[PDB]
From a paper:
The mammalian SLC13 proteins are members of the larger divalent-anion sodium symporter ([name]) family. [name] proteins typically have a molecular weight of 45–65 kDa and form obligate homodimers. Each protomer consists of a scaffold and a transport domain. Structural information, along with cross-linking and computer modeling, indicates that [name] proteins operate in an elevator-type transport mechanism (Reyes et al., 2009; Drew and Boudker, 2016; Garaeva and Slotboom, 2020).
To obtain the structure of a [name] protein in a substrate-free, Na+-bound state, we purified [name] in 100 mM Na+, but in the absence of a substrate, for single-particle cryo-electron microscopy (cryo-EM). In a parallel approach, we used amphipol polymer to preserve the transporter protein, which allowed data collection on particularly thin ice to maximize signal-to-noise. This [name] structure in amphipol, without Fab, was determined to 3.16 Å resolution. The two cryo-EM structures of [name] are in a substrate-free, inward-facing (Ci-Na+) state and provide an opportunity to describe the conformational changes that occur upon substrate release. The Ci-Na+ [name] structures are very similar to each other, with an r.m.s.d of 0.75 Å. Comparison of the previous Ci-Na+-S and amphipol preserved Ci-Na+ [name] structures also revealed prominent changes on the periplasmic surface. The loop connecting HPoutb and TM10a, from Ala395 to Pro400, has moved on the periplasmic surface. The C-terminus of HPoutb also unwinds by one turn (Val392 – Glu394) in the amphipol structure. As a result, the conserved salt bridge between Glu394 with Lys337 of H9b from the scaffold domain breaks, and Phe396 moves away from its contact with H9c. Finally, the side chain of Trp461 is inserted between TM6, TM10a and TM11, packing against another conserved aromatic residue, Phe220.
Numbering used by the authors:
A (entry chain C), B (entry chain A): 18 to 462
Write the structure that this text describes.
Amino acid sequence: LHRNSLIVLADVALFLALYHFLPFEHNVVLGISMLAFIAVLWLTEALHVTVTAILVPVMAVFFGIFETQAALNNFANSIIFLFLGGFALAAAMHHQGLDKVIADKVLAMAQGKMSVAVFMLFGVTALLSMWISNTATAAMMLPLVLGVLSKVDADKQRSTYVFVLLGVAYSASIGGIATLVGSPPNAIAAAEVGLSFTDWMKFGLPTAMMMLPMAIAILYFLLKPTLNGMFELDRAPVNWDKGKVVTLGIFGLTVFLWIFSSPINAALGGFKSFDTLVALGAILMLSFARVVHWKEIQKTADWGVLLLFGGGLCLSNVLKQTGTSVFLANALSDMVSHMGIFVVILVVATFVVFLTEFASNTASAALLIPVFATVAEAFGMSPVLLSVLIAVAASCAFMLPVATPPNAIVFASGHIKQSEMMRVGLYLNIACIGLLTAIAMLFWQ
Amino acid sequence: LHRNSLIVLADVALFLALYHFLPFEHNVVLGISMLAFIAVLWLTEALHVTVTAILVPVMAVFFGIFETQAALNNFANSIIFLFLGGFALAAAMHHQGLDKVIADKVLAMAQGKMSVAVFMLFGVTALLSMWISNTATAAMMLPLVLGVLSKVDADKQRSTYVFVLLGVAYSASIGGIATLVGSPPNAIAAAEVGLSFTDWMKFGLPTAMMMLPMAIAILYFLLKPTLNGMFELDRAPVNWDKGKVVTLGIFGLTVFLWIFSSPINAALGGFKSFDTLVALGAILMLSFARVVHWKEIQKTADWGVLLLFGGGLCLSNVLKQTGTSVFLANALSDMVSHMGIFVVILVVATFVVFLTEFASNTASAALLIPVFATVAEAFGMSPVLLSVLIAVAASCAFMLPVATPPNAIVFASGHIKQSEMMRVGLYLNIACIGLLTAIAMLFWQ
C-alpha cells in the first residue's frame, strides 16, 4: 500500500533472493542477507529505526544464529546505561533551569553587542551538546537567538539570521562529537571497540575544537552578516539558587570521575565499566538530592536510541558469529591493498558525511561501524580509527534539515532558504572530510 | 533534610550495622544487609522504586559480587520485552481508539439500563486490564462511568457512584491477574520461576474469574445501590474502520500465538522464549502495518517498570549467588516444619495483601518473590506456587488509594468516602486471602 510498506516487501524479496542465489556457505549468505535487509530498512527509514533494531534479534533467532536471551542481552550493554545517566543529567539541568541560566550568564559576558554574542553562543551550545543532546540544545537556544535578533531589522538581512541559526545547529551537532554522550554514534563506536569516556574524548574534543571554528569561518565567508547591533534584552536576569548549585556540583563530580576513570578504578578494585557505574551513581545522587524525579528522566530520554544500540550490537555480534566479517575482510583485502589507507578513510568519510544528509546519523553509524570494524582488515588493523571516524562523520550533517533534528528545528523559523543551507553544507562537508582525513592520518594513525 | 532523605540515611546506617554486627559469614551477611537496605527503600518508596532497582546492580558490584555486565544483563530478560510488546499493543489499541470502541459497543449490548451496564463494564474493564494496564484502563473508563451516572440523581445516592467506581478499579486490578502482561508482578514471578504466558494463564484466569464476581457481590452486599435508571447517552456511537480491524487482528494473532506457544515452538525449532519473540513480532506487525508509531509506544510505556524487573532479577541472582537463599531456607526449615503449608501460604497471602495497601504492588512483589522462591524450602518445594500467590496478592490492593494508581484515579472524583473504601477493602482483602488459600490448596497444591 504505502511507500514504506512496499519498500519492506521489496527488502523481503531481496533478502530471499540473496538467501537463495548466493554461492557462499549458508551462514555467510545469511549474514550478508540480514545485513542488506537491515541496511535497506535503516537508510530508507521505512520502519522507525528502533523497530528495525528490535527486528534484528528476531531475524537472528528465527534463523538459528543466537539463543533468544543471548541476543537480547545486547540491549543492556553498559554503554546504554551510561547514555541513560547522560539523559538523566540533561533532565536535571533542564528541569532545574540550569542550561538557561548558563546561556544567560554567558549572554551577559557580552555586554550588549552581537559581534561577540553569537560566537559565545556557538561555544556554549557545543559545551551543552557535549552532554545534553543535539536536539534539545538547539530547541533550547532557538528562542534565545530569536530574542537576540529581535532588534536586527530582519529585512533584506536574512544573512545574519541564517548565520546565528546554522551556527547553533552545527555547533550542537559538533559538540555531540566531544563526549561519549552527546551523540549516540560515539557510544555505538565505543561499544563496538570498547572505548572509555576519556579514551574517546582524546579523539573527539580536539576534532570538535578544530571543526567548529572552521565551520563558523566557512559560514562567515560564504554569507556576510553585519553583526554590529546591540542587545535590547528584556527577559529576567535569572540567578543561581539551591537545586542548580547541587546539580552543577553533581555534574562536575560525574565529569571528574569519568575523565579520571582509569586511576580511580585502578585504586578501587578494577571494575570493568566504571564509567557506567559513575553514570548510574549520577542518577542516584540526583535522586537522593531530591533535585529531579524519574518522570522527568522518562519524558526526556529517548529510549528508542537505547534499543537502537542493542540492535546495532546484535548485528555486530551476528557478523562476528556467522563468520561474515572475516569473509568480507578476505574479500576486500585486494581492494584495500591495491590502494592506500589514506584514500580508504577519505572515501569512507565522504560516503558517511554525504549519507547522513539523507539518513539518520545513529542508524548509519550503527550499520556501518560493525562492518568496517569487525572486518579486522589485513593490510592494517586500524580497528578503532575507522569506528571513531564514522561516528564523527555521522554527526556531520549540515545539508537539508531532514538529515538531523536540529537542522529542522532551526529551519522551522521560516526564513532559511533551502539552497543556502544546501550549498553551505556541501562546503562544510568537504571541509570536514578533509579535516577528518588529516587528523586520522596524523594523530590517530 | 527531607523525610525520605533521612530514611535513606537510616537505611545506610542499618546496612552498615548489619555489615559489621552479624555472626554469619561475610557473603551471607552482605546478602542479608543488601536485602534489608533494598526492602526499606522499596517499601517506604523514598526513592522512586526504579532508582532502587538501578541501585541494586551498583550495590552488588561495589561489593564484589557481580561483574558489571553480568549484573546489567538482567535488565534484558525476555520477560521485559514481552511486557514491551504488551505496552505496544496497548499504545495501538489506545491510539486507534480500539478500547473506546469496544467499551461503547458493549454499552450498546445493554439497551439503556444500568442493572446490566455496570456488570458488563466490570467485565470489559477486566478484559482490557488483561493486556493494557491497571491505570490506563481505569482512566479510560472513568469518563464513561461519569457519563453513565450523569442521570443517576447523585444526591443522597453516593452508594451507586462508589459501586460503579470501585468495581471498575478492582476489576482492573483483577484483570491484571489473568495474563503475564497486565500486571508487572506476574512477569516478575515468571522470570523468577520461568513461567510461560499460558502456564501462567492456567493460574490467573480461573483465579480472576473467581475473585471478580466475589468482589462485585461483596460490594453489592456492603453498599446497597439502586441500579434501576436508564441511559441518556449522547456521545458518538463510533464504528469500526481500517486501523481498528487490523489492530484487532494482530492482537488476536498475538494472543493465539501466545496461548499455543508450546505446540508451535515445538514444530518450529524449539526457541527458548517464544512468547517474547511473539511480542516483538507484534511490535513489528503493528509498525509494518502503519497503525502505530514508536513515539506513541514511548510516551505510553512505563520504562521504570522495565528497569524494576531487572532490579528484582539482579536481587534474586544476588541471593542465589552469595548463598543467602539456601541459608534462609536452612534457618526457616524449623518454622516451616513445625506448622503446615496451608497456614504458611495463609500468613504469606495476608501479609502481602495488607502490605501492598501501603506500598507499591510491583516493588513488594519484586522484593518478596525472590526470597520465598530462592529459599528452595525443605519440607516442600512449592517454588512456583508461592511466586504466583505473591504476584496475585500484590495486585489485590483494595484499601486507600495511595496503594494503587487506579484507586486514586477513581478517588479523584471527590465523592468516595475514605472510610467506605477502607472497610470494603478490608472485607475484600480477607475474602481474597481465603480464596487464594483455597485455590493454592486445591488446584496448585
